[PDB]
Amino acid sequence: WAESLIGLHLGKVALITGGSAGIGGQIGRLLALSGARVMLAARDRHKLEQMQAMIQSELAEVGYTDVEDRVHIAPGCDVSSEAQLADLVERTLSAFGTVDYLINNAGIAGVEEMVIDMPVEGWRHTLFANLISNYSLMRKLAPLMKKQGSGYILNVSSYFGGEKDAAIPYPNRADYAVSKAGQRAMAEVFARFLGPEIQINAIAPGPVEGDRLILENKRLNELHAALIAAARTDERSMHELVELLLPNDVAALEQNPAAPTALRELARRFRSEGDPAASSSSALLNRSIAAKLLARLHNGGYVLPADIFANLPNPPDPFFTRAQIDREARKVRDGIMGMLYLQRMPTEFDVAMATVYYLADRVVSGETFHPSGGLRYERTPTGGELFGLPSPERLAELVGSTVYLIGEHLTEHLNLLARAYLERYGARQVVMIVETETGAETMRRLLHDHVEAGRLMTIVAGDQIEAAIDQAITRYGRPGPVVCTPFRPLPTVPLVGRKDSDWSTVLSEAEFAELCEHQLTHHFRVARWIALSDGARLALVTPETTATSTTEQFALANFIKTTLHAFTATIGVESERTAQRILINQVDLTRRARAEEPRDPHERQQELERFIEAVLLVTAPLPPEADTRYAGRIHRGRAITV
Amino acid sequence: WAESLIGLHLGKVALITGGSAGIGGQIGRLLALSGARVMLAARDRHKLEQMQAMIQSELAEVGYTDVEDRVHIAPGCDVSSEAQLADLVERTLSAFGTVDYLINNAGIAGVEEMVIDMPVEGWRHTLFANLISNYSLMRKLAPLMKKQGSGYILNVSSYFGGEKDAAIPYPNRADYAVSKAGQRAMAEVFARFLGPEIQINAIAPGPVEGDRLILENKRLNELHAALIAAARTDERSMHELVELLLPNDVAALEQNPAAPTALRELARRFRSEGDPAASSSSALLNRSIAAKLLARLHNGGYVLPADIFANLPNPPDPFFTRAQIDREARKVRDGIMGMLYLQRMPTEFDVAMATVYYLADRVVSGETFHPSGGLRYERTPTGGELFGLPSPERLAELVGSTVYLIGEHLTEHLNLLARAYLERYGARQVVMIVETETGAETMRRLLHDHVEAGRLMTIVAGDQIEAAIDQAITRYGRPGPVVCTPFRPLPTVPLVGRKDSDWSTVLSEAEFAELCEHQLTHHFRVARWIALSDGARLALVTPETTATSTTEQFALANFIKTTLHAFTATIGVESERTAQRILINQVDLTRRARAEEPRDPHERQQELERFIEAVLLVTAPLPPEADTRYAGRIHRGRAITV
Ligand SMILES: NC(=O)c1ccc[n+]([C@@H]2O[C@H](COP(=O)([O-])OP(=O)(O)OC[C@H]3O[C@@H](n4cnc5c(N)ncnc54)[C@H](OP(=O)(O)O)[C@@H]3O)[C@@H](O)[C@H]2O)c1
Ligand SMILES: NC(=O)c1ccc[n+]([C@@H]2O[C@H](COP(=O)([O-])OP(=O)(O)OC[C@H]3O[C@@H](n4cnc5c(N)ncnc54)[C@H](OP(=O)(O)O)[C@@H]3O)[C@@H](O)[C@H]2O)c1
């Protein structure tokens, strides 16, 4: 079986992150069998040493000599650590000289929560481990690769990272989905810069065979929605409503005449549509669900003590039995199985084998290979240019609305939008949330007339966008339309260096992390906070490309547009599963080609009008009667191109 | 080099169409080296025999014995011939028993003309050779494959067939582009039906190294546009305007005071921006350009004798010299080269090698592998669901408009659209072009009030849609909005048979050809005729999928939607290069999933309103002042999903 592999990658040096187990261990093993010298990177030393022993023993069996020199290890390597990525490169280069193949395989699961329950630092941690680490290792190894005249960067993405011009929602996994989409987007935009010397592609396998949370999240969403629904028609404070759950008795809450209908019917739902073995039938929640519920309520603006769930009775272990956990696991399994065309789940070996053959192909770059797959999962095509504007009736509902505009560098766009909302659509007020005081003054000067009239308010967010949104809520009231534009423009730095250059001017690893902060994390933070604000319609706006934008800005803007589509599509689905169920969509100011951009003042006037129409389309209210299952999914998680 | 291939496809029987040269010859050669018994199909016997000798000799060199039994040939096999496809299967099955691998490699260039110059029979011929042939061979071999428990269908598509949720315009190659898109769409929709036993994928390579028309087409478009522009501001008939070109002297036409400015300036353009070696500087045209110009004029409604260009002086050979032909070939070459990320053109061998490794992957189906590529070419994302309606100003321009509605089975949609145009938007008249008399009566009854008032006219097209459009032009005047819906619904037949069944009820090869006739050729014929009608805005409407549509109808509807996007995107670009430069876009009534469809009367009301808005968006007039380079490409070749 291994005879087909002999001599396939002979003379090549491969660096494989996550190389001690899973798909990475298999890629490392098969690349070594192919004749390549491999460096396996992971955290645990023991696991790496056991894998090294397995590979070396198998190389000896097929006939290799000096097997110790063909398989090396790098323990204590956490890809989320920049310093650890620098030691990895130094250790690899010291053991084998230049790296031919960079296999960016490591990929953590992430937070595994809905965006509204996802700590900001958790999201950043996933981006560091799964995405930023990929640019970082490329940045260190691409100069060597270019100098020797050849190289290969392979990012191990997922089917769940979507595709070119198509986003895939991955609910409870937004951080993971975005990082996967970014690995693919990187290969797509860096290919023209890394070529002809370096190839850069992605692999996007579907689910693979190898090495409860949908129910625990269901319990959280159910309690939260009922608490918010009961708050609508009950005089008691959220504090007093939460107190009804404090005995943590499902039967008592159901039989409580003093408890609101929404909470009584929820307890009836828990007991009837529940397993009598699992304590999720007798108890309302555990402290993990309680802390998440409290954080949702606190983020939403409700006042409750931090210790409200301190004296909460811990449901005697288990809170969920062995039976109900395996039942949902089998429900998930048959779901994944029933999505697979071939209905025979691929293995880690299958993906690695198909990947090791694909690495031999020298005439592809900027592509996403699917070594396994063909899933029945739903796609959100992203990039529709043909759209008009909402009906005049939906536009008439903007009369007296409260608008939040978030931004700083897109001053012409912010001024135009603010004026369109107040002058054309009779909005009551616009709250301009900027980053800096200079940004606030620039906007107050452009909108002097509306500032004087009390129609345009300014707030300086700095790096505290959430607290700034709370200031706007308390001071000016909850918003209808929310337009989130980036504070920062895209950098104008080289993305590759000259063959014999030091690469000292090329976009650094810290600058790539900053790009993600300002162009991805900025929108995530706004969305996470606004998703709990009832009646909000959020437009996430990507940076602007023009006919004069640099070639590097086109690449970085297209990297952001694709990566953010994964976020927009994921949160679009997540919001339909919440009580507030707001609207979230993406408006793209980035295009793929310079030739498509306006070339004169008339075409620019046309473009800026299209921007206003696209924002109005996604910020016009969707009446509750019109928010059907059919129309609801149509008005969430979409992306349109100006 | 071939040692990696030994035993890779050992025990497999492969049938390769177009197996005597190109990518097919290479796939056949490498599959045989891999241990497979191969059957090479093509037309020329000699070519097949030389390839068979090359492969057999190479198999003997690497160590195989009885090389005559491993490589067979099927000469006189034209894939556009159904009877020839049936002999191919009988001959293959008789030589090797069951076929394991169907390599649908054969693919003719096609007509290599713009849609407006493409004979209807030429387009059908490309569809027969490149697309229908693929279903036909699958239909014959899939029953055997299912019975033995395994099989593989590989359609050799192109980068120019686009991608899932993304269309690629290929100007002058619409027939070719559609056939390539269809090969991919087939793999995408048949995968869930052919699995678990059979794998079905596509390969989409970019341009490959192996074995004038943009200039000849430029000469045709230039003469045509100037003749139409001169007709606008000149009293003389088209006959009399064409007569000015009869001496076929560029210098005389330039120096002719009696000739219109557009024609004089065209001759100045030909001589100045022209090569003095090539007769395209001294002569206006040849009879190939003259016949095409005449057919355009005749199709457009101009009266001219068939013999107008009979006594035309043939420009002494050459009409285009060796120098100017090679100059444009190098302009094309560097264009393709400057599109390639790696800037090193792949070879036929490279594609075949990457394909032969990919065929070993057992855990993929419904995918499109790119064995070479990563082009800088432009994409039209297809399937935007978020759109509103045109501005009230653009909608006000519909007052007094002439509307053509083409259809038959979508009676509710036709009645609704007709009523929306006449009742809401004050259109002067609607011309309902049906297929049959029963269809005309159904519509006259649903629209009784508008028929009585003289606002709704009916025409029965039968299989003469062009002559029916001419009848509408002469009788009711040229149209503004044109809504082209299919006459026929989608069939309700099985797409696969049971393991031990005869497959006698499964969609036949003739029924698959009929599906293409009614769902692809129907729109092509309308578009080809309407593209020369000044002021027209054409909506090409795909069939309807509902919550109750069969699983086979979902597959066939999605096959059509994807395949037609290639057409819409191609003609969208072609129209911008003509004098009439009409609008052409696609409105999709087909969705990917049943869950997305309306489930109640309120959701259906919403869906039908979305249909009206989508049609209005693409049929609202684009004022000439607003038809800039920027906005013009935005309003052509798009597809939106209802
Ligand atoms: N599994 C699937 O179904 C599937 C499908 C599509 C895509 N993918 C992608 O395939 C890749 C590999 O997935 P897998 O299934 O093989 O995962 P896995 O089994 O969890 O990965 C295990 C390997 O990753 C290492 N690792 C984990 N966290 C690390 C960190 N922070 N830094 C460095 N190494 C780390 C592990 O060792 P230590 O813990 O000792 O560090 C071990 O070597 C990922 O990029 C994933 O997104 C997987
Ligand atoms: N070349 C590229 O750059 C490129 C790029 C992307 C996709 N493709 C696709 O790759 C495939 C192969 O292309 P290629 O470049 O190898 O083309 P090619 O050189 O023109 O194909 C030659 C082979 O096709 C056979 N053939 C031609 N017309 C046929 C017909 N009507 N019936 C049966 N066999 C026929 C030829 O023999 P006879 O004339 O004797 O029949 C010969 O065996 C096609 O499907 C094409 O669409 C090609």
CA B582-B586-B588 angle, to 5 degrees, is 160
Owner of token pair 């007094």: B400
Q: Which two tokens stand for residue B104?
A: 């649908």
User: Which of B525, B639, B537, B625 minimizes the C-alpha distance to B590?
Assistant: B639
A630 and B387 within 8 Å at the Cβ level: the answer is no
The Cα A589–Cα A494 span in angstroms is 22
Count Cα neighbours of B607 within 13 Å in the Cβ-side half-sphere.
21
Per DSSP, B372 falls in state S
A527 sits in which H/E element: helix A522-530
A191 is in an annotated binding site: no
The Cα A318–Cα B84 span in angstroms is 69
The Cα B320–Cα B313 span in angstroms is 15
A37 sits in which H/E element: strand A37-41
On chain A, the residues whose CB falls within 8 A of the CB of B397 are none
User: Which of B287, B285, B280, B290 minimizes the C-alpha distance to B323?
Assistant: B280
Tell me which residue in B3, B606, B618 faces A7 most closely, judged by beta carbons.
B3
Asked if B635 is an interface residue toward chain A (Cβ–Cβ < 8 A), one would say yes
Q: What is the largest CA-CA distance in chain A?
A: 84
Cβ-contact B544, B608 below 8 angstroms:
no
Cβ-contact A515, A503 below 8 angstroms:
no
| Residues A561/B626/B268/B227 CA torsion (nearest 10 deg) | 120
On chain A, the residues whose CB falls within 8 A of the CB of B365 are 341-342, 374
| Residues B138/B142/B143/B148 CA torsion (nearest 10 deg) | 150
In our burial notation (b when 16+ CB lie closer than 10 A, e otherwise), range B536-575 reads bbbbbbbbbbeeebbebbbbbbbbbbbbbbbbbbbbbbbb
Owner of token pair 């900001």: A120
Backbone angles phi, psi at B430, to 5 degrees: -120, 125
The Cα B486–Cα A433 span in angstroms is 51
- How many CB atoms neighbour CB B97 within 10 A? 12
A21 is in an annotated binding site: yes
What distance in angstroms lies between residue B17's CA and the mean position of ligand 2's atoms?
8
- DSSP count for chain A of H helices, then E strands: 23, 16
The Cα B104–Cα A142 span in angstroms is 39
**Chain centre to alpha carbon of residue B468:** 23
Q: Which two tokens stand for residue B586?
A: 């696609």
Per DSSP, A544 falls in state P
| Beta carbons within 8 Å of B312's beta carbon, 6+ residues apart | B246, B248, B285, B287, B290
- Could you give all domains of chain B from N- to C-terminal order, each with its CATH number? 2-209+345-377 (3.40.50.720), 213-327 (no CATH), 382-496+531-641 (3.40.50.720)
The Cα B399–Cα A13 span in angstroms is 71
A·B CB contacts under 8 A: 246
| Beta carbons within 8 Å of B381's beta carbon, 6+ residues apart | A165, A166, A381, A382, A383, A384, A385, A641, B165, B166, B167
A174 sits in which H/E element: helix A174-194
Tell me which residue in B4, B341, B592 faces A4 most closely, judged by beta carbons.
B4
User: Which of B494, B508, B194, B499 minimizes the C-alpha distance to B366?
Assistant: B194
For ligand 1, say whether the CB of A182 is within 6 Å of any of its atoms. no
How does strand A537-541 pair with strand A481-484? parallel
Peptide bond into B392 cis (omega under 30): no
Which strand ranges, in their side-by-side order, compose the sheet holding B71-74?
A: B71-74, B37-41, B13-17, B101-104, B151-156, B198-203, B368-369
- How many CB atoms neighbour CB B319 within 10 A? 19
- How many CB atoms neighbour CB B62 within 10 A? 13
Which of A201, A363, A538, A562 has the most B C-beta neighbours within 10 Å, making it the best mutation to test the interface with B? A363
What distance in angstroms lies between residue B24's CA and the mean position of ligand 2's atoms?
7
A218 sits in which H/E element: helix A213-232
A379 and B344 within 8 Å at the Cβ level: the answer is no
Instruction: Please provide the size of chain A in residues.
Output: 642
Give the burial class of B173: count Cβ atoms within 10 A of its Cβ; 0-12 exposed, 13-18 middle, 19 or more buried.
Answer: buried
User: Which of A216, A221, A162 minimizes the C-alpha distance to A564?
Assistant: A162
Q: Which ligand minimizes its atom distance to the CA of B157? A: 2
Q: Which two tokens stand for residue A376?
A: 């029945």
The Cα A508–Cα A346 span in angstroms is 38
A619 sits in which H/E element: helix A601-619
- How many CB atoms neighbour CB A258 within 10 A? 7
Sign of CA dihedral A398, A399, A402, A408: positive
- Residue by residue, DSSP assigns A560-603 as HHHHHHHHHHHHHHHHTTSSS--EEEEEE---S-GGGS--SHHH
B361 and A365 within 8 Å at the Cβ level: the answer is no
| Beta carbons within 8 Å of A189's beta carbon, 6+ residues apart | A366, A555, A556, A558, A559
Q: Which two tokens stand for residue B410?
A: 């979508």
B180 sits in which H/E element: helix B174-194
Per DSSP, B179 falls in state H
The angstrom resolution of this structure is 2.2
- B539 in helix, strand or coil? strand
| Beta carbons within 8 Å of B351's beta carbon, 6+ residues apart | A363, B23, B26, B203, B205, B208, B371, B372
- A521 in helix, strand or coil? helix
The Cα A432–Cα A266 span in angstroms is 40
- Residue by residue, DSSP assigns A420-473 as IIIIIS--SEEEEEESSHHHHHHHHHHTHHHHHTT-EEEEE-TT-HHHHHHHHH
A250 is in an annotated binding site: no
CA B532-B536-B541 angle, to 5 degrees, is 105
The Cα A230–Cα A250 span in angstroms is 17
Sign of CA dihedral A261, A262, A263, A269: positive
Owner of token pair 């009293």: B235
The Cα A149–Cα B197 span in angstroms is 44
CA A465-A469-A474 angle, to 5 degrees, is 150
Tell me which residue in B7, B341, B384 faces A386 most closely, judged by beta carbons.
B384
- How many CB atoms neighbour CB B89 within 10 A? 21
Name the residue with the closest Cα to ligand 2, atom 37: B42
Q: Beta partners for A481? A: A537
Task: Could you list the residues of B known to form a binding site for Mg(2+), using ranges.
Answer: 231, 234, 545, 575, 580, 597, 607
Q: Give the Å distances, CA to CA, from B546 to A167, B412, B536, B554.
A: 24, 14, 30, 9
The Cα A23–Cα A27 span in angstroms is 6
User: Which of B588, B537, B585 minimizes the C-alpha distance to B560?
Assistant: B588
A residues 156-185 closer than 8 Å to B (CB) = 163-166
Name the residue with the closest Cα to ligand 1, atom 45: A107
Backbone angles phi, psi at A389, to 5 degrees: -135, 165
The Cα B159–Cα A363 span in angstroms is 14
Q: Give the Å distances, CA to CA, from A19 to A48, A51, B76, B461.
A: 7, 8, 54, 66
The Cα B570–Cα B197 span in angstroms is 36
Owner of token pair 């990272």: A161
In our burial notation (b when 16+ CB lie closer than 10 A, e otherwise), range A120-149 reads eeebbbbbbbbbbbbbbbbbbbbbebbbee
The Cα B184–Cα B585 span in angstroms is 21
- How many CB atoms neighbour CB A491 within 10 A? 16
User: How is chain A split among helix, strand and coil, in percent rounded to 5?
Assistant: 50, 10, 40
User: How is chain B split among helix, strand and coil, in percent rounded to 5?
Assistant: 50, 10, 40
**A376: closest CA of chain B, how far (Å):** 9
The Cα A158–Cα A377 span in angstroms is 13
- B21 in helix, strand or coil? coil
In our burial notation (b when 16+ CB lie closer than 10 A, e otherwise), range A448-464 reads eebbeeebbbbbbbeee
Q: Give the Å distances, CA to CA, from B518 to A247, A387, B64, B301, B490.
A: 67, 29, 50, 26, 9
Asked if B97 is an interface residue toward chain A (Cβ–Cβ < 8 A), one would say no
Per DSSP, A518 falls in state I
For ligand 2, say whether the CB of B158 is within 6 Å of any of its atoms. yes
In our burial notation (b when 16+ CB lie closer than 10 A, e otherwise), range B334-354 reads eeeeebbbbeebbbbbbbbbb
How does strand B166-167 pair with strand B380-381? antiparallel
**Which chain B residue lies closest to A367 (C-alpha atoms)?**
B374
First to last CA, chain B: 53
User: Which of B389, B404, B411, B386 minimizes the C-alpha distance to B615?
Assistant: B389
A residues 359-388 closer than 8 Å to B (CB) = 360-367, 369-374, 376, 378-379, 381-388
The Cα B28–Cα B8 span in angstroms is 14
Q: Which two tokens stand for residue A190?
A: 């860096």
Name the residue with the closest Cα to ligand 2, atom 26: B18
| Beta carbons within 8 Å of B172's beta carbon, 6+ residues apart | B112, B113, B114, B213, B214, B217, B574
User: Which of B602, B609, B610, B596 minimizes the C-alpha distance to B640?
Assistant: B610
A389 and B391 within 8 Å at the Cβ level: the answer is yes
- How many CB atoms neighbour CB B408 within 10 A? 23
Asked if B630 is an interface residue toward chain A (Cβ–Cβ < 8 A), one would say yes
The Cα B229–Cα A95 span in angstroms is 72
The Cα A440–Cα A554 span in angstroms is 28
The Cα A386–Cα A531 span in angstroms is 27
**Chain centre to alpha carbon of residue B246:** 35
Q: Beta partners for B16? A: B40, B103
Q: Which two tokens stand for residue B547?
A: 């919550």
CA B271-B273-B276 angle, to 5 degrees, is 55
| Beta carbons within 8 Å of A197's beta carbon, 6+ residues apart | A145, A146, A149, A150, A151, A499
Q: Which two tokens stand for residue A237?
A: 């404070």
SS (H, E, C) A293-343: HHHHHHHCCCCCCCCCCCCCCCCCCCCCCHHHHHHHHHHHHHHHHCCCCCC
Q: Which ligand minimizes its atom distance to the CA of A109? A: 1
Alpha helices in A359-408 (DSSP H): 392-396
User: Which of B170, B209, B168, B204 minimizes the C-alpha distance to B184?
Assistant: B204
Alpha helices in B34-173 (DSSP H): 45-61, 82-96, 120-127, 133-148
Per DSSP, A538 falls in state E
Cβ-contact A18, A73 below 8 angstroms:
no
The Cα A191–Cα A370 span in angstroms is 18
Which of A26, A145, A342 has the most B C-beta neighbours within 10 Å, making it the best mutation to test the interface with B? A342
Cβ-contact B271, B255 below 8 angstroms:
no
Per DSSP, B584 falls in state E
Sign of CA dihedral A40, A44, A45, A46: negative
A331 is in an annotated binding site: no
The Cα B598–Cα B331 span in angstroms is 51
Amino acid at B508: S
